[PDB]
Amino acid sequence: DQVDYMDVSTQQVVSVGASLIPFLEHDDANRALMGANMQRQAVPTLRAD
Amino acid sequence: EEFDAIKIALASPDMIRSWSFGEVKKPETINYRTFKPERDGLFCARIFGPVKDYECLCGKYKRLKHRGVICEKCGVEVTQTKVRRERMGHIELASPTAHIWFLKSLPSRIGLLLDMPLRDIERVLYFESYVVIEGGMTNLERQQILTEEQYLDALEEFGDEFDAKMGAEAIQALLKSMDLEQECEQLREELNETNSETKRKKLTKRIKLLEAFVQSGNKPEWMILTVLPVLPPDLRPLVPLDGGRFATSDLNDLYRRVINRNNRLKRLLDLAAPDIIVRNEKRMLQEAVDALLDNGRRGRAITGSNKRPLKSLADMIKGKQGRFRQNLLGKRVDYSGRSVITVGPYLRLHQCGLPKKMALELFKPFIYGKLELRGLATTIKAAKKMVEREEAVVWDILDEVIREHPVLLNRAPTLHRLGIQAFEPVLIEGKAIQLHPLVCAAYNADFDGDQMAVHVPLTLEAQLEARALMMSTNNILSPANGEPIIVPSQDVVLGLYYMTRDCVNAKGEGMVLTGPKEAERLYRSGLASLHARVKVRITEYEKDANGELVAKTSLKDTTVGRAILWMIVPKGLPYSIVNQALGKKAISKMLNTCYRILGLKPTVIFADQIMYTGFAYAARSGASVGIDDMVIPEKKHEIISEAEAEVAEIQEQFQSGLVTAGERYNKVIDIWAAANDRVSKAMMDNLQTETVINRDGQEEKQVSFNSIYMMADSGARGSAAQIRQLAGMRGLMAKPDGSIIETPITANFREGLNVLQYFISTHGARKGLADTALKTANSGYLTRRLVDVAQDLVVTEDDCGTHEGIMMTPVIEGGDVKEPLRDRVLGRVTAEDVLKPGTADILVPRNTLLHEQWCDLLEENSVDAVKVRSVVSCDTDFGVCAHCYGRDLARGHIINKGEAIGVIAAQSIGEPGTQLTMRTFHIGGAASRAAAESSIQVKNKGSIKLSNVKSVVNSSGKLVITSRNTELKLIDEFGRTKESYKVPYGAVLAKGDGEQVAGGETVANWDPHTMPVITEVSGFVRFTDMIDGQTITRQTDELTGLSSLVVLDSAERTAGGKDLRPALKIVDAQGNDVLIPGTDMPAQYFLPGKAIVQLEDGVQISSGDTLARIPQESGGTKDITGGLPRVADLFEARRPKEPAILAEISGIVSFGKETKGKRRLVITPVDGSDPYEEMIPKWRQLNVFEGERVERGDVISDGPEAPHDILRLRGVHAVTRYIVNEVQDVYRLQGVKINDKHIEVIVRQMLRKATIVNAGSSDFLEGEQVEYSRVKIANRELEANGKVGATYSRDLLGITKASLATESFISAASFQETTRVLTEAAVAGKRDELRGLKENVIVGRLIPAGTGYAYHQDRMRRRAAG
Amino acid sequence: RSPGVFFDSDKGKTHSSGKVLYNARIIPYRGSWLDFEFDPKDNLFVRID
DNA sequence: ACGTATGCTATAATGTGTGCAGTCTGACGCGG
DNA sequence: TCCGCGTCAGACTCGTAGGATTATAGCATACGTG
Ligand SMILES: Nc1ccn([C@@H]2O[C@H](COP(=O)(O)OP(=O)(O)OP(=O)(O)O)[C@@H](O)[C@H]2O)c(=O)n1
Ligand SMILES: [Mg+2]
Ligand SMILES: [Mg+2]
Ligand SMILES: [Zn+2]
């Protein structure tokens, strides 16, 4: 009865950069940060895989 | 071009005219279409010279046919454009203008010389009030300011007889009239009368300025500029862009502001305009001049086009972005290339991959050279094209020159000398550099996208220097610690570990082999595992008494893998070294052993072979990272669930109102801290020996071959601390503020964090990575600060001829010996014959280096304490001797004379701090402290030996200690210190002084999260100066009503009870005081701030009861972030805000007079008849209790020790022993290894200057503070000639100040305060003769150290020979 | 920083006194600043801009 | 003649302001 | 001489990236060189 509201999804804490990382839950926030920072630096390849 | 010194003096208006080749009279830069100088403009060729090499403007005289011809029409000479940056100009100022650097650069200088304040002078300048120059009629005296009202009064009344004027004109006439000869004598006379501190300081400084000003030959009028120099136009360029735009420096713009206003003043003086306007024009003119010299200083810096401030002159000499740091000491350099580095696992140590196309461009002049020799190129543009076409036969020539040619490889940042190492380039087709794995440690080079700069040593000397000094093979051990930095890691360690490590039976257990070759035969044949115990016949080679090697053949029970590793092992080391399972820590000893025994060659080979076999067998293993490998212990959910209910219990007790918030905060940390270590150990206990399932007959227990464990146990990557997060518990993270989150992370990385568990993990992660970026500048700035002071130190003499040394003892702190005496006193020259226990025969000579083998005999004899020849005990003037320093830890034997230590020392100190502020700041993110020091348990049996202890027995029957720095020793059978502890104040001892204890007995016990105030006498408690609301507060509960009292400090205290000291006074049953046994002190314990008290007024007490409990909140992981500042403060010599008092001279203590609790002390020494009084606070407690035999510098108060207080009293070897212990304590907390001699270097430099006390044969006199070396050279001639000795007293100097003290002003301005350094050096007229490195690196000469030491001294004999 | 009013206190301007000196500050979207601040003797002061 | 430079106009008008304001520890330097 | 508050000094080292302003009358003799 004390609960008034609830988080809608489980992804609202994070951003777009971080929502693309799978198993973020099993990753240190220091390496998670670098991982999302490098995912932005990913040059698209010849054939989109 | 080759000189001796550089001088700085004041630019006279007449002097400025000597450099100037003309007067710029117009702001006109160039004509708009004809891009050419204008008539006597700022780019005038009639003043600054011609545009091109030998070409006049109009074009009448061209090139060298008209060598030095001056044109008629334009009036321009025909010399090189060379002169356009050499030739200067000037401007004839209508009215004189004041220099901002001799007005605003404090001290005032112009005001310090006149004995006149700032306001007074400025209000004269901006025309607010007149100033008297000289009053004939003594009515008005000199330097007396008169407002616009007061000038008019004297004009009609007195007038004429008084001369007073306004603006920069007046102050110049004041400077021009003042007599330096007379006002020097006047000040000396006033000094003889009754001199104080401030009065004598002011007088002596002015006195020296006045004498300095006369001897510098400077005149105080040059402070005001009648002439203003112009910078050469090429040094303030107006050059055109490719895009048809132009671009000009901000100087040109600032110059046009000066000339316009100056010419407008000439115009207004032609018109005889009213003075009100002339005033504005003069104020403007000064604003422009001051803005030109130093823009942002006097007022708002004149902003320009892009709303930004104009860059002035001073700005190009000022700080980082100045010429010094940016365009002189640091340079972009030719024969230089950089590229992404990648691994070079095939290379040897003395090799590195260099791309072809890189080395191609780098060695361009060496190709053209070898080409003309072969006759393939006739000329150089022919050779240029041959290279460009990249034809086949040019690759083979490039390949020829590069062989037997070293290259320098640098990685940023350059922390220590090993940040550059030289190799023999190996051309590789690819844009990547390939670097040797073992030296990756020195650079800290991770192949994750690192780039390393290449540099080619051009000169043959540079090729020899690179091969001799900077070669990777010649650089093994760190200079900081005598320890190998060239040591495998990562794969290499793991591979050897896999090899050596053994297992049960396996294939072919207990077999029997001819050699370690049959072991390779059987393993690779598929009929034996590397983990099989088999008897093998190996023949080990042991060194004898001489150089000959003895051979011994025997049956060794090892493993197949160990046997194969013996093949790599050179013959000279024992086999017992590879008989163990090898790890990183074991491997580091193999190379060190190999080095100390065989030499250099054997080690380089060994090092490489170790690396090769390491990688190869690591890859044969197939070591992996499955998720079944991250094993969580069986009973994690069992530990936590009930460790949570543990914390939930106290939470309900707190809201009830007994356990306070601070006690709960420390109490909950202890529960989690136990649970965290509980889960950590259950993990490794289930993970280390997970292999409980073996064979042979039925079973056996064995080490686990879990991939992750092997990778941690071997010491390859990660540790027990990391695995905790993976399979165990992540642990408690740290906030970005510094406080630790009460709720830690329960989950690990296998099970997966929930949404918050990650949100929580962020707080500690961001703050840990914030201190990686921001905190690094303080540590790197320390390196800079240390270096400058330690630039000059170089090994000069071979033997200083001094007896003085430094007694060192073994660092035995925290039971287990922290640092052995052998390691402490290693490679340091003795100062005293140190023999064995039985004093009847010598064993170690006085002047002899301590090799590791000589130190081994110190262990047999068990040396007590040693006087080592230290750096600070050196008598060598301008440097040190090789004996004082001892061995070069990097090399491995006695240091070369000429090697520049100071820089090596500074680097060694700043590297660890700068490296421990980024390694566990990017990979960590959580606190790991365990400050639950509840109780000392003694481990070996001994007699209890306390020292510096004053205890008292309590009601319970327990020895309670009432002294702060109590130490506890552990004395063995014969009578020597084995273990040592710190017992704190109010601790309960199990057994008192002299009593026997057994092993594993709690000898001491106390509460860590509390600092009790314990009594020495029995009776009742009285409240004194404990008024509710002013000094203390009160808070009650319910039914009965137990109230606690909390003492407020000056922060939470009103202005009413500020001088009231709150204390719990002891009284008897009658109500009178109770004297403390054997002292005239009525019992009164002063409670400090935030002191929680449970007993209220009128409560009976025995001796040993706790009156109040002072909270001890300190749960912030010091790490390196909050430990470097303390290092800096020590070096910078900043006295603490609670220094401890010490006795000056030895004699009889005699307590004296008092002032409302403020205690004095009338000490009357036995020899010294004149008493000495010093004052003491009330709340502060002393250590001595009056009437005593005190010596020089006994401890009277407790707290932090002031570095100045130590040298002032207890001499040099006391302050050196302090800093060295204090500094190392901070680095030892972090596991940073530094030899004490490196700190001793900086200490020595901090003892550079010294104040003189007593008049000498030279005009020293009192108040002067000269360098210690110069005054001692005067004492050399004094003891020979007699005359009057110059007695002294050495002073301690902070780093920042010790750098600005050195006679070299170039070294000082190159550092910081550059605006001040130059002005002080100009007024003094000082000439720098260059001794330091910074000095000769600037001028680009030979460094008076290292390679250049042999050369510089060969020039010093040119000076000596006539 | 959002315009309006804001209450802060330098937890020890003068650690000499170690007194938590409380201060208030009116931050507009356009206009001059209006601050009120105490002192060691708890005298209210106003410092426009 | 060509380019640059100097010159004069006649209602009355007569004191400017503009713009970033969570830095911070440490160290002196003028009054009070 | 001591306290309070004003100014003034620092804050690691190398690599890469790209752009844009407003306006000053209007006309008639005076000054400098082919
Ligand atoms: N802002 C930075 C980033 C990096 N470095 C340099 O780059 C090195 C490596 O940084 P990084 O690869 O991020 O750290 P590692 O310790 O290699 O950790 P990781 O496992 O995350 O790669 C640092 O030690 C340092 O020499 C630096 O000086 N300043
Ligand atoms: Mg890297
Ligand atoms: Mg890396
Ligand atoms: Zn010409």
DSSP state letters, B172-189: HHHHHH--TTHHHHHHHH
In eight-state DSSP terms, residue B1015 is -
B752 to A30: CB separation less than 8 angstroms, yes or no = no
CA distance to partner chain C, nearest, from residue B1053 (Å):
8
Q: SS3 breakdown of chain C: % helix, strand, coil, rounded to 5?
A: 0, 45, 55
Does B918 sit in the ligand 1 pocket, CB within 6 Å?
Answer: yes
Cβ atoms of residues B433 and B409 within 8 Å:
yes
Confirm whether any atom of chain E, the nucleic acid strand, is less than 7 Å from CB of B245. Answer: yes
Highest CATH level, class, for B934-1006 = mainly beta
Peptide bond into B107 cis (omega under 30): yes
Q: Which nucleotide is nearest to B38 (CA to C1')?
A: D4
Q: What is the C-alpha to C-alpha distance for residues B258 and B252, in angstroms, rounded to an integer?
A: 10
Ligand 2: centre distance to CA A14 (Å) = 27
A29 to B725: CB separation less than 8 angstroms, yes or no = no
Ligand nearest to the CA of B412: 1
Decide the pairing of beta strands B1172-1173 and B451-455. Answer: unpaired
Q: What is the C-alpha to C-alpha distance for residues B959 and B990, in angstroms, rounded to an integer?
A: 7
Q: What is the C-alpha to C-alpha distance for residues B737 and A30, in angstroms, rounded to an integer?
A: 17
Helices B584-597 and B491-500, packing angle to 10 deg: 90
Q: From the CB coordinates, do chains B and A have 3 or more pairs under 8 Å?
A: yes
Residues 6 or more apart whose Cβ sits within 8 Å of residue B124: B130, B131, B145, B166, B167, B170, B171
Residues 6 or more apart whose Cβ sits within 8 Å of residue B533: B502, B509, B510, B557, B558, B559
CA of B144 to C1' of D32 (A): 21
Cβ atoms of residues B532 and B546 within 8 Å:
no
Element at B665 (helix H, strand E):
helix B661-687
Decide the pairing of beta strands B1100-1101 and B1019-1024. Answer: antiparallel
Coil/strand/helix, residue B295: coil
Closest to B538 in 3D by CA, of B504, B562, B510: B562
- The fourth-level CATH superfamily of domain B627-775 is RNA polymerase Rpb1 funnel domain (1.10.132.30)
* Cα angle B592, B419, B850; round to 5: 35
The residue whose CA lies nearest the C1' of nucleotide E4 is C14
Q: From the CB coordinates, do chains A and C have 3 or more pairs under 8 Å?
A: no
B1050 to C41: CB separation less than 8 angstroms, yes or no = no
Decide the pairing of beta strands B238-240 and B246-248. Answer: antiparallel
Peptide bond into B516 cis (omega under 30): no
Does B385 sit in the ligand 1 pocket, CB within 6 Å?
Answer: no
CA of B1026 to C1' of D31 (A): 38
In eight-state DSSP terms, residue B739 is P
Question: In CATH terms, is domain B1295-1361 a member of 1.10.150.390?
Answer: yes
Q: What is the C-alpha to C-alpha distance for residues B1285 and C5, in angstroms, rounded to an integer?
A: 71
Here the tokens at position C4 are: 């309006």
B1051 to C41: CB separation less than 8 angstroms, yes or no = no
Q: Which nucleotides of D are covered by protein (CB under 7 A)?
A: 19-22, 26-27, 29-31
Ligand 1: centre distance to CA B1296 (Å) = 29
- Nearest residue of C to residue B1058, measured between CA atoms: C17
Here the tokens at position B1182 are: 């002393």
Residue type for position B48: F
Sequence length of chain C is 49
Phi, psi (rounded to 5 degrees) for B195: -95, 135
B659: left (phi over 0), alpha (psi -120 to 50) or beta: beta
Phi, psi (rounded to 5 degrees) for B885: -70, -60
Residue type for position B1276: R
Decide the pairing of beta strands B988-989 and B6-7. Answer: unpaired
Confirm whether any atom of chain E, the nucleic acid strand, is less than 7 Å from CB of C16. Answer: yes
For tokens 């360029």, what's the residue? Answer: B237
Coil/strand/helix, residue B997: strand
Here the tokens at position B242 are: 């490719």
Q: In this complex, is the C-beta atom of B753 within 8 Å of any C-beta atom belonging to chain A? A: yes
Q: What is the C-alpha to C-alpha distance for residues B360 and B358, in angstroms, rounded to an integer?
A: 5
Here the tokens at position B445 are: 């080079």
The residue whose CA lies nearest the C1' of nucleotide E13 is B413
Ligand 2: centre distance to CA B450 (Å) = 5
B920: number of Cβ within 10 Å:
17
Q: What is the C-alpha to C-alpha distance for residues B550 and B572, in angstroms, rounded to an integer?
A: 9
- Nearest residue of C to residue B1089, measured between CA atoms: C18
Does B403 sit in the ligand 1 pocket, CB within 6 Å?
Answer: no
Minimum-distance ligand 1 atom for the alpha carbon of A30: 21
Cβ atoms of residues B727 and B706 within 8 Å:
no
Does B449 sit in the ligand 1 pocket, CB within 6 Å?
Answer: no
Q: What is the C-alpha to C-alpha distance for residues B1203 and B1130, in angstroms, rounded to an integer?
A: 8
Cβ atoms of residues B426 and B347 within 8 Å:
yes
Q: What is the C-alpha to C-alpha distance for residues B999 and B989, in angstroms, rounded to an integer?
A: 16
For chain B, give me the number of helices (H) and strands (E)?
42, 52
In eight-state DSSP terms, residue B81 is G
Resolution reading in Å: 4.0
The DSSP bridge partners found for residue B453 are B338, B410
Q: How many contacts does A have with B, using Cβ atoms within 8 A?
A: 35
- The sheet carrying B1249-1252 orders its strands as B1265-1267, B1249-1252, B1288-1290
Q: Contacts of residue B749 in chain A, CB cutoff 8 Å?
A: 26-28
CA of B38 to C1' of E30 (A): 22
Coil/strand/helix, residue B983: strand
Coil/strand/helix, residue B419: helix
- The sheet carrying C21-27 orders its strands as C4-10, C21-27, C34-37, C45-48
Confirm whether any atom of chain E, the nucleic acid strand, is less than 7 Å from CB of B320. Answer: yes
Residues 6 or more apart whose Cβ sits within 8 Å of residue B252: B29, B42, B236, B238
In eight-state DSSP terms, residue B1141 is P
